[PDB]
């Protein structure tokens, strides 16, 4: 009756912080025996819940949101934290209870040819509401028209590459991050153990 956390974390296909990936866990026994107890976890921290109580806590549903960001930007995934990734890309609430985990994927997702497949968000018109998927293909602007008919000025594309390549230092090594949010709204709990 074990949850699919295994796959979730080991699928090694993580897409992007741009239009992140989600999963709604339900109908399982949340073991946790491996969670925050596996060996290669680098950083784990939850707000609102203690780890052992967590191992004994029980809930109605779970939301996991995995993505990949640059190591120097992990400090921006935090309650109400302000920056770029946390203001225009993906913003977690202020009273968010749950924990995040981050791995230095300095080998798994990188290529000498440039593992820049993912394009993070660097141009947004207005700050994000918490958990607002804003995957879009538009041209952010300054002049009248967008780049379809203009060039140079007002020809911006919000999806900018990362350029992950091995010479990059630690501060620029792709960290894979996963955030857990436990919802408790009036419903029978299908996740406890």
């Amino acid at each position: 009756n074990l949850c699919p956390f295994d796959e979730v974390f080991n699928a090694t296909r993580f897409a992007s912080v741009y239009a992140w990936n989600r999963k709604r866990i339900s109908n399982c026994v949340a073991d946790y025996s491996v969670l925050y107890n596996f060996a290669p976890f680098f950083a784990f921290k939850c707000y609102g819940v203690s780890p052992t109580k967590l191992n004994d806590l029980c809930f109605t549903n779970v939301y996991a949101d995995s993505f990949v960001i640059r190591g120097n930007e992990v400090s921006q995934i935090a309650p109400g934290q302000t920056g770029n990734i946390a203001d225009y890309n993906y913003k977690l609430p202020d009273d968010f209870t749950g924990c995040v985990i981050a791995w230095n994927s300095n080998k798994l997702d990188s290529k000498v040819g440039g593992n820049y497949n993912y394009r993070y968000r660097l141009f947004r018109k207005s700050n994000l509401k918490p958990f607002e998927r804003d995957i879009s293909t538009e041209i952010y602007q300054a002049g009248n028209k967008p780049c379809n008919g203009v060039a140079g000025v007002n020809c911006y594309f919000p999806l900018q590459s990362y350029g992950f390549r091995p010479t990059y230092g630690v501060g620029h090594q792709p960290y894979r991050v996963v955030v857990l949010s436990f919802e408790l709204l009036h419903a029978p709990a299908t996740v406890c153990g």
Epitope: D87, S126, N127
Partner: antibody
Framework: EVQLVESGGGLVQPGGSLRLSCAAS????????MSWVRQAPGKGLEWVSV???????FYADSVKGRFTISRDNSKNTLYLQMNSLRAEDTAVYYC????????????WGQGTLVTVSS | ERVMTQSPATLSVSPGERATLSCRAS??????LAWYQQKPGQAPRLLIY???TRATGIPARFSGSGSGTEFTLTISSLQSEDSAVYYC???????????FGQGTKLEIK
């Protein structure tokens, strides 16, 4: 033409306050990453402050806690309020629109001298 | 906070020849750079961003090179008005960040 014009430069006694203003043309500011730079006479340059297109601002450490950036979106202009000017801050301040990886800082302002009484 | 150091301080080359300016970083900077030419009397002017991409309009006479922690700017044929100060600006942390250099003084004869 696209330009940034500045005002507020002058002289004020130390510890006093001042307010720098920046007007733009042919380009929007509300949706443009703004960055105020300054230059001491004869020395290099240093990033002073930045305001984003959503409002979340940031400041350098040397001036943290003393300067506050704001912008009158209604008439397409930027502003920087200063306080507690000490002996270092005598410098010329520039207004810039910085894009970053997609084109580094380009459009700059004529500048404004800021010296103190003594 | 990567500290950039320019070199040499001064350079005097006969008109019509090449000119070489080095700017040295302390960390890794990959291809995050730019070059500014601040003709004496007004604000600087952007010449070449990223690694070597020539800003719009900027005469082809300029050429940038280098990567990692070391970069170089090269001018094909200096005309009389090329005399100015030049600065290498890094931006490895863009929101919010930049770090300037000490500048270089270039003259003619």
């Amino acid at each position: 033409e696209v330009q940034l014009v500045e005002s507020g430069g002058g002289l004020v006694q130390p510890g006093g306050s001042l307010r720098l203003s920046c007007a733009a043309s042919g380009i929007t500011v509300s949706r443009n990453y703004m960055s105020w730079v300054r230059q001491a006479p004869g020395k290099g340059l240093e990033w002073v402050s930045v305001m984003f297109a959503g409002g979340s601002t940031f400041y350098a450490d040397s001036v943290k806690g003393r300067f506050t950036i704001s912008r009158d979106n209604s008439k397409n202009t930027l502003y920087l309020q200063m306080n507690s000017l000490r002996a270092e801050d005598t410098a010329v301040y520039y207004c810039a629109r910085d894009l970053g990886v997609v084109g580094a800082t380009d459009y700059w302002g004529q500048g404004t001298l800021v010296t103190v009484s003594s | 906070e990567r500290v950039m150091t320019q070199s040499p301080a001064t350079l005097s080359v006969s008109p019509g020849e090449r000119a070489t300016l080095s700017c040295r970083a302390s960390e890794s900077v990959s291809s995050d750079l730019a070059w500014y030419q601040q003709k004496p009397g007004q604000a600087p002017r952007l010449l070449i961003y990223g690694a070597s991409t020539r800003a719009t309009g900027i005469p082809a006479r300029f050429s940038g090179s280098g990567s990692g922690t070391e970069f170089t700017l090269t001018i094909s044929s200096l005309q009389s008005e090329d005399s100015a100060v030049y600065y290498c600006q890094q931006y490895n942390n863009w929101p919010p960040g930049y770090t300037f250099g000490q500048g270089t003084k270039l003259e003619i004869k």
